[PDB]
C-alpha cells in the first residue's frame, strides 16, 4: 500500500525456546519490523498482563518479557502478540532440587 498510515506488521526475529530452573528468571526476547503500539503476551491459552510476574517492555523494534518466580507450571507455549502478528516460544522450568522420589 502507498500513501497509507496503517501497515501490516511482522516479526524480524522470532523468540527462542528458553531453559531454566524454577523460581528463576526467563526473559523472552523478540523483535519486530515495526514499533508495535501495543503488545499482548499470552501464556498457555491465557492472556498475560504487566505484573510482578510478567513485566513486558518496548525498546523501539525490540521487545522482551521478564518472567520471574518461574515454576513447573510456567512450562508452556507463550505467544507474543503485537496486533498484526504473533510469535511463539517454548519454556522449560527445571527443578533446582531433583531429589529421589522413590526413597
From Swiss-Prot:
Localization per record: Cytoplasm, Myofibril, Sarcomere, M line; Cytoplasm, Myofibril, Sarcomere, Z line; Cell membrane, Sarcolemma; Nucleus
Classify the source by domain of life. Answer: Eukaryota
Q: Where in this chain does the record put each Ig-like domain?
A: 13-92
Name the disease: Rhabdomyolysis 1: An autosomal recessive disorder characterized by severe and recurrent rhabdomyolysis, usually with onset in the teenage years. Some of the episodes may be triggered by exercise or heat; others occur spontaneously. Rhabdomyolysis is the rapid breakdown of damaged or injured skeletal myofibres and may require intensive care management. Muscle breakdown results in release of myofibrillar content into the extracellular space and circulation, resulting in hyperCKemia (hyperCK) and myoglobinuria.
Query: Where in the full protein does the shown chain start and end, and how long is the full protein?
Result: 2915 to 3004 of 7968
Main role? Structural component of striated muscles which plays a role in myofibrillogenesis. Probably involved in the assembly of myosin into sarcomeric A bands in striated muscle. Has serine/threonine protein kinase activity and phosphorylates N-cadherin CDH2 and sodium/potassium-transporting ATPase subunit ATP1B1.
Disulfide bond annotation, renumbered to this chain: 30-80
Q: How does it assemble?
A: Interacts (via protein kinase domain 2) with CDH2 and (via protein kinase domain 1) with ATP1B1. Isoform 3 interacts with TTN/titin and calmodulin. Isoform 3 interacts with ANK1 isoform Mu17/ank1.5.
Protein name in the entry: Obscurin
Into which family does the record put it? Belongs to the protein kinase superfamily. CAMK Ser/Thr protein kinase family.
- Describe the PTM: Autophosphorylated by protein kinase domains 1 and 2.
